[PDB]
Symmetry: C2
Subunit: 221 residues, 2 copies
């Protein structure tokens, strides 16, 4: 019953991409029982140097709806409330790469996801730094597998960001999660997470930001 | 100022696919100024014979946010409140096809979209009738062009529905819209509509249904 109700969420990211330093603070709430996520992110350091869509996977998979018969495969919720470290190496096809480390744990009533991001090799003529990506999102299947030795899971999927000239920027994701505590955690059978995401703005919001709504449901078992 | 506020929406579809007759009633509201759409659809004839995702494009493009400098390209809103007839021939790659005719007009305070759908050639072993499609949606760019002679627009795009085995069902859309009134309507320059859609369920909803949230913004000018 840690996630049985609507849980408040706080996201804090400090990043660095080709020297361009910035920060993003996010607020929202998620309903696990429904896999619904509702968040708002403001770029507290001015104008975001990178497209908002490229930070979507970075800025809380524990809010996924795991159907009843899969509750024994929910590593995310089983690491709570102590948490898990989420690391990723995301490769933007024919452009730079992001390296992010984040710890997502409960801090009282709020589920907090603190992250650090470093991105490099981004061409200044590229989609990413060129800001040639459209403000929208597709739906992908996120693949999970247990990592026995490390006592976590290995996750992996490819994101397809849309470019304004009907092209598609691919972004390969290499993700790993380990619990932060020493208590046993649920190591799951192979399965994926079907996730849908939608980006919108906010009229009454003056600062640079992104509104993100997202639905996630576990499957493959 | 017909669409300046939140407008209520009513969708009514009666369909026939390979003989399987059914009806879908939908309710919701849209905010044009924001391009946000929020609708809920119930299958009033029992269990929907076709996957809910295949009816998404069928079940009100006048709720798109047309940035200020494009208000002269908004055919949809310029046909109001009298309306427009929206016809489509959608071809499901390697499977059947849908033929839908719908009139969408204002009926008092509510924007009503009444539709008739006939689908044929759907293989019983196919994705569609086989219900092998996942309950989710991608984002596509809907292409508009004026149709001088007919006094409307020709619209066209391809939808990529996801299949549970990481495949992609393509669905070619051939759409045409003509005003219902004889007053002059705005014929637009070529441009597209960037649309994002997300499907979800509803806990307190017992009947067969689909919850659809959708963001649309005009571009290409």
């Amino acid at each position: 019953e840690l996630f049985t109700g609507v849980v408040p969420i706080l996201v804090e990211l400090d990043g660095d991409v080709n020297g361009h330093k910035f920060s993003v603070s996010g607020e929202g709430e998620g309903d696990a029982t429904y896999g619904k996520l509702t968040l708002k992110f403001i770029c507290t350091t001015g104008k975001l140097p990178v497209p908002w869509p490229t930070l979507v996977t970075t800025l809380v998979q524990c809010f996924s709806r795991y159907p009843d018969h899969m509750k024994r495969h929910d590593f995310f919720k089983s690491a709570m409330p102590e948490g898990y470290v989420q690391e990723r190496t995301i490769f933007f096809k024919d452009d730079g790469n992001y390296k992010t480390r984040a710890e997502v744990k409960f801090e009282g009533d709020t589920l907090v996801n603190r992250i650090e991001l470093k991105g490099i090799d981004f061409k200044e003529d590229g989609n990413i730094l060129g800001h040639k990506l459209e403000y929208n999102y597709n739906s992908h299947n996120v693949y999970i597998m247990a990592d026995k030795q490390k006592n976590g899971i290995k996750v992996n999927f490819k994101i397809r960001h849309n470019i304004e000239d009907g092209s598609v920027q691919l972004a390969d994701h290499y993700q790993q999660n380990t619990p932060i505590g020493d208590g046993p955690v649920l190591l799951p059978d192979n399965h994926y997470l079907s996730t849908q995401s939608a980006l919108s703005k906010d009229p009454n919001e003056k600062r640079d930001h992104m509104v993100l709504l997202e639905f996630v449901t576990a499957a493959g078992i």
